[PDB]
Design a binder for this molecule. Sequence first.
Ligand SMILES: Nc1nc(=O)c2ncc(C(=O)NCC(=O)N[C@@H](Cc3ccccc3)C(=O)O)nc2[nH]1
Length: 262
Amino acid sequence: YPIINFTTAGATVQSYTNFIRAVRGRLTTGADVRHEIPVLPNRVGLPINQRFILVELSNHAELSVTLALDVTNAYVVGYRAGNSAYFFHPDNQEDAEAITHLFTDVQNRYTFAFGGNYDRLEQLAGNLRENIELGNGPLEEAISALYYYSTGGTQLPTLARSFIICIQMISEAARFQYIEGEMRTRIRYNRRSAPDPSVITLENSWGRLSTAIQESNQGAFASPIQLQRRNGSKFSVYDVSILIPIIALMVYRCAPPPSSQF
Ligand SMILES: Nc1nc(=O)c2ncc(C(=O)NCC(=O)N[C@@H](Cc3ccccc3)C(=O)O)nc2[nH]1
């Protein structure tokens, strides 16, 4: 599987931007672009050799971990640190089979009994996303925490917190230019901060936004989607147009309707 490298060591806006762009480039082809917004490959009939990408994360502490991302949804399905690999509890038998194709040379393979969704990870972390700081420092620390899990150095709440950091700074940033921008800001000033309601509501709405765009009538939503601004106030989305600078990738929901051209 293709590997994309990022390091927190001396990270800049440019090096992070290069990284996120490269992740997007490995997640998607140019085959499926709707209202200027790329769609991830359809799960249905996707060959196993095209199913995953690998994100090799290094830090200033000279430690490396490799995340495995599912190309169908940019989901972090598990990770490798040295001679151990850990996978989140699969949703189904097909996904369970799929992950057997990841880190095949690794000495120790584990599947967590828990799923990798935010709700579960927040429960285990003892903190919600809104109270978990993001930025280069948190990511540096997250890489170390993932690295030391197999040897007993990392408590489960810290591991869960560290997953939450990685997921948002990689997968969510890939999904949303807006979230990429929010991480760029944190990196630029080297100041960690928890995600505000604009970030949280985008994350929570990714599936619904993807479906609404794909089901839209020439871009127009049948039902508006409510997001939140930075201050927590409501922002109503009626149309794909407003989302073009915000959403970089969509999960596949359906084949697009025939070209609507007059
Ligand atoms: N491990 C992991 N990798 C991710 O990329 C990821 N990305 C997102 C979430 C998550 O709970 N999101 C909250 C949410 O409301 N998700 C929606 C939208 C969605 C997000 C990601 C993938 C598919 C759908 C849903 O589950 O329906 N969890 C993740 N866990």
